[PDB]
Ligand binder design. Structure first.
Ligand code: CDL
Ligand code: CDL
Ligand code: CDL
Ligand code: PC1
Ligand code: LMT
Ligand code: LMT
Ligand code: LMT
Ligand code: LMT
Ligand code: LMT
Ligand code: LMT
Lengths: 81, 80, 558, 77, 237, 85, 125, 189
C-alpha cells in the first residue's frame, strides 16, 4: 500500500506509512508476540465452519458499500482516457 | 519465564515520540509561510508533547535508572 | 481551563511517586472543574443555533454550554468518591464550629478510614477522568468530521484506560480488554462512516453536509443516497458506544468486571456526550418534504435500536442475580426511551429528550453512590454465608450479589429508602421524577404517531419493573445475613481519641467504640440531595423544564 | 543532602547544574527560546534591522480599476 | 565541625560504618558477656580468660566519660522512674513498640546495670516517603467478610495502635551524650584493638561464644582419647 | 613516522567517490545535449523544458528567435493517462 | 492524612489553578462587553473615542500586523468569540488584524463630523 | 547537533562502544547451540555499507557535502594587476611577474577547469575525502573506548541526549524567527 501511494504521487504520506507502521507499530507487535508464550494450537479454530458465513457476509457488504463509493474511485471497447 | 516490561516501554515511547517528531517535519519545510502564527502553534504542540516526556523521565518508565547508619542506639545509665 | 488543568496536574504528578498524594490531587481535580463551571456559566449570554469557533472546527451553542456544565458537575460528584475517605469518626464532643475549625481530633485513623485502600492510591486516576471529560466536551462542540473522530477517540481511549487501572485485578484487566477490542471495532464503523461522507461530498464540515442535504430535500445524475447510508454506518458505532441493543452484549460484562468506583464514571459520562451530539445531527438531517430521501432515513436504526433495547433490556434483566449486571441491563432499557425521543424529531420529543437524559444521569448516579456506601457500611458487620466467601475482587466490588442486600432495611433504614426511592424512579412510579420523564417521552410519541412503540414501551416497563421489585423485596422483605461484628462492641474494645486545641494541648480524651464510626459526610449529603430531588420534583419543576423549553425553542426557531 | 527547590531556590539551581547537567541545561536552553523571542526582535527594531518584505507566492495583481490601455492592437500585429 | 563523628560515615573498612553510640554499645556488650559467664564454673580457664580480658577492657571504656554525662544521667534516671511503663519489655516487647515511624525505647538490665535501647525511625527524603513511613499492611478487607477473616486481617489492632502524633501520655526519651571524635581516638589508643567500630565487632563476638561454650561444656574432661598410633607420623629414632 | 600502507585503502575510497562524480557528471552532460544538467526542477521548470521541446525538439534546446515557427500553435502536448487522476 | 510535604505541594498546584482560572475569569468578564453579551455603555464611549482619535491621527484603525493579510485572516477566524470557549480551551488575540465584525463607517463618520466642528472654531477665531 | 548526530550514528549502526547487547550472545552460547550469521557475507556488507552510508549522510548534513572551499575566490581578492599580455602580475608582497605560457598552459588550464569531468571529479573527491575522515572517526572510536552496558546507553539516549535535542527544537526556530532568517520553502537553489 505504501508503494501504491508513492507510485501515484503521495510520497510524504506513503513514506509516513513506511516510517510509522512498518517502522514502529509492527515492531511493537513483534516485541510482544516474541515474548508472550503462544501455543499455536490453542489459537487455531475450526475455520471450515465459517465458510458459509464468509460467503454470506462477503456478498452483502460488497453489494452495498460499492454503490457508496464515488465515480472517480471506480473509474477503472471504448475506454475513457 | 516472564518477560521484562521495559521491552514494551521501549517500543511505546518510541512509537509515540516518533509519531510526534513526524508531525513536526511539515513545519520545517513550511516555516516561511507559517511565520509567527505557525511558530506559536508549533511551540504549543512542542510544549504539550514535552510535558508527557517529563512524565516518563519523572517516573523512570523506561526503568533505566535505579540500578548504612544503624537505628539501634544504646544508652548507659549505670548501676541500679 | 480543562486543558490548563490537565497540563498543571500532569506536571505535578510527573515529578512525584508518592501514593499518599492522590487524595489531594483528586481534591484539586474538583477545584479545577469548578473554575471550568465558572467559565461556561459566564458563556451563556446569547441566542444562536450556533457559532463556529477556531476556524469552524468547533461550534458553541446554548445547548452546548448547558451540557458542558452538566458534564462538569456530574464529574465533580463522582470525584468526591476518591477525594474523601469512606468512613469518619464523629463524637458530640467535637461537633461545633469552634471544634471543627479551631480544635483537632487525633486517633489511629488508618484502619477505620481505609487510608491505604486501593482507590486512595492510584495517582493518575484524577488525571485520566479529566482526559475523558475533555473528549466528552469536545464531542459536544465538534463542527467537522475529523473533530468528531479525534474527540470520540480521546473519550473512548480514556475509558479503556480507566477500565484497566486496577492493574492487579484479573477482572479489571479482562474488562478493559473486552472494552478496547469491541470499542476498536466500533471506531472503525465511526471512521468508515465519516470517510464515506467526505469522499462523496468533498467536505468535512457538518454545515456544508447539512446544506447539501437541505438542497436535496425537494419533492438527477447525483442522488444524495450517501448521506443516509453514511450516517447509518456512523450511528452503528455510536449505538455500540451507548450499549443500545443489538450491540449491547459488552456492557453487562465490562460493568460487572471493573471496580464499582470506576463503573460510576464509565457508565454515565459516555452517554451524555454521545446523545447530545446525535440530537443536532438528527435535527438537520430531517426530511421536511416527504420524498424518497426519507425512506432511507438513518433515524430508523435508532427506532429499531430503541425497540430492541426496550425488549432486551427489560426481558434479560429478569434472571440476573448480580447487581451490577442488573444495573447494566436497566441502563439499556433507559436508552430505549432516550432513543425513541431522539427518533421522533418534534419540539415535544426534544424537550422530553433533554429532560430524560439529565434526570437519568442524576438518578443512576444515586444508584451507584448508594451501592458504594452500602459496601463501605459492612466494615462493622460480618457474615457466615458460604456463597459470599467465594466472590472475586471483594475489595473492588464489595456488593456483587443482590442477596448480599437481604435485610439492609434492618441495618440502615433510610439508606434502604434512598435505594427504594431511586429504584421506583427507574420503574417510573409517580410522584417520582422518573415518571415525569417517561410521561413526556410517551406524550411526544403519541402526539406524533408512535402509538405502536408507546404500547411496547409501557408493556416492557411492566416487565422491567419485575426485576426492580426483586431488589426492593430483597432489601426489605427478609432478615439480614449480616450480623454486627462482635469484637467492635466487646466492652473491653475501645479506641482512645484525643481532643487538642490550637496550640496542640489536650482538651479532652474520649473512649470510642465501633458505634462511633459513621459514613463520611460527602457521601451522605450527596445521597440525600438526589433522593430529595427525585421525591420533591413536583414542587420544584419550573426552572428545569423551562430551560429545556427555551433550549428547543432556539434549535427549532425560524 | 541534595537540596529542595522550594526551600532554597538558588542553592538547588547550583546543585542541578553540577549534579544533573544535561537535565538542568535542557530547561535552560528551552527557556532561552522564549527569551530570544521576547528580546532580540525589539532590539533589532531599535538598531534599524527592518524585517524583509514577504516574497510574492502568487501573481501580484494591483488594486483599482483597469487602466484602459491603448497599444499593441490587432492592426499593429 | 569535626568535633563528633558522623554516624554511618565510612570508616575506611568497607561495610563498617561509624557507630551511632560506640561507648554505650561496648559497655552493653561487656556487661552482657560478664552475665553469661556465671553459667560456667569458676575453675574453667576459659571463664577466667574471658573475665579478665573483658573486665580489663570494661575498665578502660569506663575511664572516659562524655561531657555532660552526669547531668544527662540524672534526668534520664527520673525520666525512667516516672514513666517506667513506657519503656518496659514486658509491656512493649523487645522492640519498644510496633509503630516504626515513632520513637521506640526499652529499659534493659544486664549485670547490675541499666541500659535503654532506643530504635530511631530512619531518616528518609520527604520526596519519597508515603504517609510519613507508616507501614502498609494492605487495604482493609471490605465487603461481606467472616468473623475469622476480619481477625486474621488485623481488626483488633484498632484498639492497640496509636497515632504517631498522639503524644500526651508519653514522654520523649532523650539520648545519651556522645564522646567526642578525639575522645573516641583516645579510647582506641587505650584498648589497642583498632577502630572503635571494629572493637564492637570483636566484642559482640565474645558475647556469642559464651552461648556455644556453655552448650558444649568445654571444661568437662576429654571426650575421645587418641587411640594408640593416632598422631604418630614418620619421625626417626 | 607515517604508516602510508594503512592510508592506502582510504585513498582508494576517495578515488572511487571521485570516479562516481567524475563519470556521472559526464554521462549527464552528453544526455543533456553537451550542456550542464538541470537539478531542483519544479512543475514550472519541467513545463518550460516541454515548450523547449515544442520549439526545437530537444527538452534542453534553446532558440532566441522572436517568432515561433509555423505549426508551433498545434504541437502543445496534452498528456493522456488510463488510470490515475 | 498525607505525609509531611504533601500539602505544600498541593497548595502550589491549587494556587496555580487559581491564578489560571482567576485571570481567565477576569479577562472573560472584560471581553464580554466587547462581544455585547454584557452591559457595555461605558466601553462603547471609550471605544468610540479611541477609534475616532485614531482615524484623525491617520492610524490604521486596528493597528499594523507583521503577519500576512492571509495569516491575519486565519488569526481572526480563530479568535472571533473565542473567550466563549474558555472553560474548555484558552485562546487570546495578539494580532493586529482589521476583521472585527463591525461596520467601521461610524468611526470615520464621527471623525469627519468632529473635524468639521474644530475647523469652524479655528475659522471663528 | 552534529556531535549528537555522530554519536547517535555510531549507536544506530550497533557499532562499538554501543554493541554490548549483541556482544553478550557469544558469551552465553553454551555447549549445545550456535549462531547463524556464519557463512553469510550479506549481514557484513549490510553492516559496512550502513557505516559508509551513515558517514556520507553525516557529511551531507553538517560538513560541506560535496562543497570544496574554493581557492579561486582567494586568488581573485589578492590579485589586482590583471595584464592582457599574459604576465598576470600580482599586487602582493611575495608576488612577481609570472611567465605562465598563454599558448601552452593558460589556454589548456582554463578549459580543463570548466570541463564536466574535472568539476564533477572534485565534487566527488570532496565528498569522498569528507566521508573518509568520518570513517576514520568511527574506527578511532572503536579503538578508544570500552563498551557501555545496555541500560547505560538507554539512559544516555533518553535522559541526556533527547532532552537536549527537544530543548534545541524549541530554541532553533525561535532564533530563526528573531533574526528574520526563516528560508523560503519554494524551489530555489
Ligand atoms: C515543559 C515542561 C517542563 C518541565 C520541567 C520543569 C522542571 C521540573 O521538573 O521542575 C521540578 C524540579 C524538581 O524540584 P523538587 O523540589 O525536587 O520537586 C519536588 C517538589 O515537591 C516540587 O513539587 P511541585 O509540584 O511544587 O513543583 C513541580 C512543578 C511546580 O508545580 C506547581 O507548583 C504548580 C504546577 C505548575 C504547572 C504549570 C503549567 C504551565 O514544577 C514545574 O514543573 C514548574 C514548571 C514551570 O524543580 C522545580 O521544582 C522547579 C520549579 C520551577
Ligand atoms: C438542587 C440542589 C439544591 C441544593 C440546595 C441546598 C441543599 C442543602 C445543601 C447543604 C450543603 C452543606 C455544605 C456544607 C456541609 O456539609 O455542612 C456540614 C459540615 C460538616 O458537618 P457534619 O456533616 O456534621 O460532619 C462532621 C465532620 O465535619 C466530619 O465530616 P467529614 O470529614 O465526613 O466531611 C466534612 C465535609 C468535607 O468537605 C469539606 O471539607 C467542605 C469543603 C468546602 C470547600 O463534608 C462536606 O462538607 C460535604 C458537603 C457536600 C456538598 C455537595 C454534595 C453534592 O460542616 C462543617 O463543619 C463544614 C464547614 C461549613 C461549610 C463550609 C462550606 C460550605 C459550602 C460547601 C460547598 C460544597
Ligand atoms: C491548547 C492549549 C493552549 C494554551 C495556550 C493558548 C495560547 C493562546 C494564543 C497565543 C498564540 C497565538 C498568538 C501568537 C501568534 C502571532 O502571530 O503573534 C502575533 C505577534 C505579532 O503580531 P502582530 O500582527 O504584530 O500583532 C500585534 C502584536 O501584539 C504586537 O507584537 P509585539 O510588538 O508586542 O511583539 C513582542 C511580543 C511578541 O508576543 C506577542 O505579541 C504575542 C505572544 C504572546 C503570548 C503570551 C503567552 C500566551 C498567553 O513579545 C513579548 O511581548 C514577550 C513575549 C514573547 C514570548 C514569550 C514566551 C511565551 C510563552 C511562555 C511559556 O507575533 C510575534 O510577535 C511573534 C512571536 C509570537 C510567539 C508566540 C509564542 C507562543 C508560544 C506558547 C507556548 C505555550
Ligand atoms: C438533584 C441533584 C443535585 C446534584 C448536585 C448539584 C446541584 C445543582 C445542579 C445544577 C444546578 C445549576 C448549577 C449551575 C452552576 C452554578 C451556577 C449558580 O448556581 O450560580 C452561578 C454563579 C455565577 O456567578 P458570577 O459571579 O459569575 O455571576 C455574575 C453575574 N451576576 C453578578 C449578575 C450574578 O456562580 C458561579 O460562580 C458559577 C460557578 C460556581 C462553582 C461551581 C458550582 C457547581 C454546582
Ligand atoms: C525543554 C526540555 C526539557 C527536558 C526535560 C526537563 C527536565 C524534566 C525531567 C525531570 C523532572 C524531574 O523528574 C525526576 O526524574 C528523576 C529521574 O528519573 C526521578 O528519579 C527518582 O525516581 C526514579 C524512579 O524510582 C529513581 O530511579 C531515581 O533513582 C530517583 O532519584 C524523580 O522521581 C523525578 O522527580
Ligand atoms: C433541580 C433543578 C433546578 C433548576 C436547574 C436549572 C436552572 C438553570 C437554567 C438556566 C437556563 C435557562 O435560563 C436562561 O437561559 C438563557 C438561554 O440559555 C440564558 O439567557 C442568557 O442569554 C440572554 C440572551 O442574550 C442574555 O441577555 C441573558 O442575560 C442571559 O441570561 C441563560 O442561560 C438563562 O437566563
Ligand atoms: C386497545 C388498547 C388501548 C389502545 C388505546 C390506548 C389509548 C389510546 C388513546 C387514543 O388514541 C390516540 O388518538 C389520538 C387522536 O386520535 C392520536 O394522536 C394523533 O395526533 C395527531 C394529531 O395531528 C394525529 O394526526 C395522529 O393520527 C395521532 O398521532 C394518538 O396517537 C392515539 O394514541
Ligand atoms: C528553575 C530550576 C530549574 C528546574 C529544575 C531543573 C532540573 C533539575 C533536575 C531535575 C530533577 O532534580 C532531581 O533529580 C534527582 C534524580 O536523582 C532526584 O533527587 C532525588 O530523587 C529522589 C526523590 O524523588 C531521592 O530518593 C533521591 O535521593 C534524590 O536524588 C529528583 O528527581 C530531583 O530532586
Ligand atoms: C438539573 C439541571 C442541570 C443544569 C446544568 C446547567 C445549569 C446552568 C445554569 C447557569 C445558567 C446561566 O446562569 C447565568 O450565569 C451568568 C454568570 O455570569 C449570569 O448571567 C449574567 O451574565 C452577565 C454578567 O456576567 C450579564 O451581563 C447578564 O445580563 C447576566 O445574565 C447569571 O448568574 C445567570 O443568568
Ligand atoms: C537516519 C537516516 C539514516 C540513513 C542511513 C540508513 C542506513 C540503513 C542501512 C541498513 C542496513 C542494515 O543495517 C545494518 O545491518 C547489519 C546486518 O543486519 C547490522 O550488523 C550486524 O551484523 C554484523 C555481522 O554481520 C555485526 O558485526 C554487527 O555488530 C551487527 O549489528 C548493522 O548493525 C546494521 O546497521
Amino acid at each position: 500500500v505504501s508503494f501504491y501511494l508513492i507510485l501515484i504521487g503521495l510520497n510524504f504520506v506513503g513514506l509516513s506509512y513506511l516510517i510509522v507502521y512498518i517502522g514502529a507499530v509492527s515492531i511493537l507487535f513483534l516485541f510482544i508476540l516474541m515474548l508472550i508464550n503462544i501455543r499455536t494450537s490453542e489459537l487455531q479454530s475450526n475455520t471450515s465452519n465459517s465458510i458459509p458465513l464468509t460467503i454470506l457476509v462477503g456478498i452483502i457488504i460488497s453489494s452495498f458499500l460499492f454503490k457508496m463509493l464515488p465515480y472517480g474511485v471506480i473509474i477503472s471497447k471504448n475506454d475513457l482516457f | 519465564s516472564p518477560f521484562n516490561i521495559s521491552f514494551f516501554i521501549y517500543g511505546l515511547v518510541f512509537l509515540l515520540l516518533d509519531l510526534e517528531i513526524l508531525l513536526l517535519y511539515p513545519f520545517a519545510v513550511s516555516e516561511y509561510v507559517n511565520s509567527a502564527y505557525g511558530l506559536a502553534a508549533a511551540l504549543i504542540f512542542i510544549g504539550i508533547i514535552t510535558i508527557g516526556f517529563v512524565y516518563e523521565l519523572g517516573h523512570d518508565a523506561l526503568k533505566v535508572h535505579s540500578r548504612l547508619k544503624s537505628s539501634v542506639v544504646i544508652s548507659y545509665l549505670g548501676n541500679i | 481551563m480543562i486543558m490548563i488543568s490537565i497540563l498543571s496536574l500532569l506536571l505535578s504528578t510527573s515529578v512525584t511517586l508518592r501514593r499518599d498524594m492522590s487524595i489531594l490531587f483528586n481534591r484539586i481535580s474538583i477545584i479545577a472543574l469548578a473554575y471550568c463551571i465558572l467559565h461556561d456559566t459566564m458563556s451563556l449570554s446569547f441566542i444562536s443555533k450556533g457559532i463556529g469557533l477556531h476556524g469552524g472546527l468547533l461550534h458553541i451553542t446554548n445547548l452546548t454550554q448547558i451540557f458542558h456544565i452538566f458534564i462538569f458537575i456530574i464529574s465533580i460528584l463522582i470525584l468526591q468518591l476518591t477525594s474523601f475517605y469512606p468512613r469518619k469518626v464523629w463524637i458530640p464532643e467535637y461537633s461545633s464550629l469552634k471544634d471543627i475549625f479551631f480544635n483537632k481530633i487525633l486517633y489511629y485513623r488508618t484502619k477505620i478510614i481505609n487510608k491505604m485502600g486501593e482507590h486512595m492510591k492510584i495517582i493518575e486516576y484524577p488525571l485520566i477522568l479529566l482526559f475523558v471529560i475533555s473528549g466528552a466536551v469536545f464531542l459536544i462542540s465538534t463542527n467537522d468530521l475529523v473533530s468528531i473522530f479525534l474527540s470520540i477517540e480521546l473519550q473512548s481511549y480514556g475509558l479503556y484506560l480507566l477500565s484497566t487501572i486496577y492493574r492487579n485485578s484479573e477482572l479489571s484487566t479482562t474488562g478493559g480488554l473486552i472494552y478496547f477490542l469491541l470499542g476498536g471495532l466500533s471506531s472503525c464503523f465511526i471512521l468508515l462512516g465519516t470517510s464515506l461522507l467526505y469522499v462523496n461530498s468533498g467536505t468535512t464540515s457538518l454545515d456544508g453536509l447539512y446544506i447539501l442535504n437541505s438542497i436535496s430535500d425537494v419533492n438527477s445524475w447525483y442522488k444524495p443516497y450517501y448521506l443516509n447510508f453514511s450516517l447509518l454506518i456512523f450511528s452503528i458505532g455510536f449505538l455500540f458506544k451507548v450499549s443500545a441493543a443489538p450491540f449491547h452484549f459488552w456492557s453487562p460484562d465490562v460493568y460487572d468486571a471493573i471496580p464499582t468506583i470506576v463503573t460510576t464514571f464509565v457508565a454515565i459520562i459516555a452517554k451524555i456526550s454521545i446523545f447530545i451530539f446525535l440530537l443536532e445531527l438528527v435535527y438537520y438531517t430531517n426530511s421536511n418534504a416527504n420524498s424518497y430521501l426519507s425512506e432511507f432515513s438513518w433515524t430508523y436504526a435508532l427506532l429499531i435500536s430503541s425497540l430492541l433495547s426496550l425488549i432486551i433490556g427489560t426481558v434479560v434483566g429478569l434472571t440476573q442475580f448480580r447487581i451490577k449486571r442488573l444495573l447494566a441491563y436497566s441502563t439499556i432499557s433507559h436508552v430505549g426511551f432516550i432513543l425513541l425521543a431522539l427518533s421522533v424529531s418534534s419540539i415535544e420529543s426534544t424537550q422530553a429528550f433533554i429532560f430524560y437524559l439529565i434526570q437519568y444521569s442524576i438518578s443512576n448516579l444515586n444508584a451507584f453512590f448508594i451501592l458504594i456506601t452500602i459496601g463501605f457500611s459492612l466494615y462493622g458487620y460480618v457474615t457466615n454465608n458460604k456463597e459470599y466467601k467465594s466472590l472475586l475482587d471483594k475489595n473492588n466490588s464489595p456488593i456483587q450479589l443482590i442477596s448480599q442486600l437481604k435485610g439492609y432495611f434492618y441495618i440502615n433504614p433510610l439508606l434502604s429508602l434512598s435505594l427504594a426511592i431511586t429504584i421506583f424512579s427507574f420503574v417510573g412510579v409517580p410522584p417520582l421524577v422518573g415518571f415525569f420523564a417517561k410521561q413526556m417521552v410517551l406524550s411526544a410519541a403519541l402526539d406524533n404517531g408512535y402509538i405502536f412503540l408507546s404500547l411496547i414501551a409501557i408493556i416492557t416497563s411492566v416487565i422491567g419493573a419485575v426485576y426492580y421489585l426483586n431488589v426492593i423485596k430483597e432489601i426489605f422483605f427478609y432478615s439480614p445475613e449480616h450480623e454486627v461484628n462482635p469484637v467492635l462492641n466487646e466492652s473491653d474494645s475501645n479506641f482512645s481519641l484525643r481532643i487538642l486545641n490550637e496550640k496542640n494541648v489536650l482538651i479532652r480524651s474520649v473512649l470510642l467504640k465501633g458505634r462511633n464510626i459513621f459514613i463520611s459526610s460527602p457521601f451522605s449529603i450527596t445521597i440525600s440531595i438526589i433522593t430529595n430531588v427525585i421525591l420533591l420534583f413536583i414542587f420544584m419543576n419550573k426552572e428545569w423544564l423551562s430551560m429545556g423549553t427555551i433550549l428547543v425553542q432556539i434549535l427549532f426557531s425560524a | 543532602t541534595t537540596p529542595r527547590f522550594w526551600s532554597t531556590p538558588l542553592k538547588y539551581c547550583r546543585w542541578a547544574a553540577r549534579e544533573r547537567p544535561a537535565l538542568f541545561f535542557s530547561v535552560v536552553i528551552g527557556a532561552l527560546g522564549p527569551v530570544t523571542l521576547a528580546t532580540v526582535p525589539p532590539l533589532r527594531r531599535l538598531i534599524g534591522d527592518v524585517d524583509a518584505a514577504p516574497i510574492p507566492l502568487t501573481y501580484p495583481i494591483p488594486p483599482g480599476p483597469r487602466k484602459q490601455l491603448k497599444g499593441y492592437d490587432d492592426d499593429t500585429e | 565541625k569535626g568535633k563528633f563523628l558522623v554516624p554511618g560515615a565510612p570508616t575506611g573498612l568497607t561495610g563498617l560504618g561509624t557507630h551511632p553510640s560506640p561507648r554505650s554499645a561496648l559497655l552493653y556488650l561487656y556487661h552482657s558477656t560478664l552475665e553469661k559467664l556465671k553459667q560456667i564454673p569458676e575453675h574453667s580457664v576459659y571463664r577466667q580468660s574471658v573475665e579478665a580480658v573483658t573486665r580489663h577492657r570494661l575498665a578502660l571504656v569506663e575511664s572516659v566519660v562524655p561531657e555532660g554525662y552526669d547531668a544527662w544521667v540524672e534526668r534520664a534516671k527520673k525520666l525512667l522512674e516516672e514513666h517506667a511503663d513506657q519503656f518496659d519489655p514486658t509491656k512493649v516487647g523487645p522492640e519498644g513498640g510496633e509503630e516504626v515511624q515513632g520513637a521506640r525505647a526499652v529499659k534493659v538490665e544486664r549485670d547490675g546495670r541499666v541500659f535503654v535501647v532506643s530504635r530511631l525511625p530512619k531518616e528518609e527524603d520527604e520526596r519519597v516517603l508515603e504517609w510519613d513511613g507508616e507501614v502498609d499492611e494492605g487495604p482493609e478487607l471490605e465487603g461481606s467478610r467472616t468473623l475469622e477473616e476480619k481477625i486474621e486481617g488485623g481488626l483488633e489492632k484498632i484498639f492497640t495502635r496509636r497515632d504517631v502524633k498522639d503524644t500526651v501520655g508519653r514522654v520523649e526519651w532523650e539520648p545519651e551524650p556522645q564522646l567526642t571524635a578525639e575522645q573516641v581516638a583516645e579510647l582506641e589508643n587505650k584498648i589497642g584493638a583498632g577502630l572503635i567500630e571494629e572493637v564492637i565487632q570483636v566484642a559482640e563476638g565474645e558475647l556469642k561464644l559464651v552461648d556455644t561454650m556453655v552448650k558444649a561444656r568445654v571444661w568437662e574432661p576429654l571426650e575421645e582419647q587418641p587411640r594408640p598410633g593416632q598422631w604418630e607420623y614418620f619421625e626417626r629414632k | 613516522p607515517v604508516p602510508f600502507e594503512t592510508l592506502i585503502p582510504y585513498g582508494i575510497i576517495i578515488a572511487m567517490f571521485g570516479v562516481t562524480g567524475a563519470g556521472m557528471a559526464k554521462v549527464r552532460h552528453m544526455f543533456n545535449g553537451d550542456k550542464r544538467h538541470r537539478w531542483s526542477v519544479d512543475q514550472w521548470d519541467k513545463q518550460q523544458m516541454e515548450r523547449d521541446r515544442r520549439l526545437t525538439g530537444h527538452l534542453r534546446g534553446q532558440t532566441d528567435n522572436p517568432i515561433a515557427p509555423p505549426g508551433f500553435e498545434f504541437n502543445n502536448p496534452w498528456k493522456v493517462x488510463x488510470x490515475x487522476x | 492524612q498525607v505525609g509531611r510535604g504533601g500539602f505544600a505541594k498541593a497548595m502550589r498546584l491549587a494556587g496555580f489553578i487559581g491564578l489560571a482560572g482567576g485571570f481567565l475569569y477576569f479577562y472573560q468578564r472584560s471581553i464580554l462587553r466587547f462581544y455585547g453579551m454584557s452591559e457595555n455603555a461605558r466601553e462603547v464611549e471609550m471605544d468610540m473615542r479611541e477609534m475616532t482619535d485614531r482615524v484623525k491621527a491617520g492610524l490604521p484603525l486596528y493597528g499594523e500586523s507583521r503577519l500576512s493579510p492571509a495569516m491575519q485572516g486565519v488569526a481572526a477566524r480563530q479568535s472571533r468569540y473565542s473567550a466563549l470557549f474558555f472553560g474548555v480551551m484558552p485562546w487570546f488575540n495578539f494580532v493586529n488584524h482589521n476583521q472585527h465584525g463591525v461596520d467601521t463607517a461610524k468611526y470615520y463618520q464621527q471623525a469627519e463630523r468632529e473635524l468639521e466642528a474644530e475647523r469652524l472654531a479655528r475659522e471663528q477665531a | 547537533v552534529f556531535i549528537i548526530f555522530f554519536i547517535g550514528s555510531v549507536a544506530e549502526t550497533n557499532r562499538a562502544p554501543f554493541d554490548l547487547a549483541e556482544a553478550e550472545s557469544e558469551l552465553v552460547s553454551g555447549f549445545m547451540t550456535e549462531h547463524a550469521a556464519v557463512i553469510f557475507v550479506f549481514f557484513f556488507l549490510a553492516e559496512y555499507g550502513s557505516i559508509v552510508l551513515m558517514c556520507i549522510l553525516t557529511s551531507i548534513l553538517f560538513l560541506g557535502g560535496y562543497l570544496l572551499i574554493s581557492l579561486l575566490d582567494i586568488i581573485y581578492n589578492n590579485l589586482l594587476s590583471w595584464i592582457v599580455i599574459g604576465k598576470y602580475i600580482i599586487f602582493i608582497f611575495p608576488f612577481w611577474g609570472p611567465v605562465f605560457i598563454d599558448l601552452g598552459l593558460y589556454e589548456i588550464i582554463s578549459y580543463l577547469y570548466n570541463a564536466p569531468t574535472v568539476e564533477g571529479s572534485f565534487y566527488g573527491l570532496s565528498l569522498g575525502v569528507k566521508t573518509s575522515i568520518l570513517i576514520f572517526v568511527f574506527i578511532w572510536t572503536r579503538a578508544s573506548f570500552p563498551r557501555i552496558r545496555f541500560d547505560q546507553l538507554m539512559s544516555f539516549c533518553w535522559t541526556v541526549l533527547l532532552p537536549i535535542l527537544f530543548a534545541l527544537i524549541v530554541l532553533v526556530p525561535c532564533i530563526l524567527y528573531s533574526f528574520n532568517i526563516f528560508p523560503v520553502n519554494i524551489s530555489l537553489l
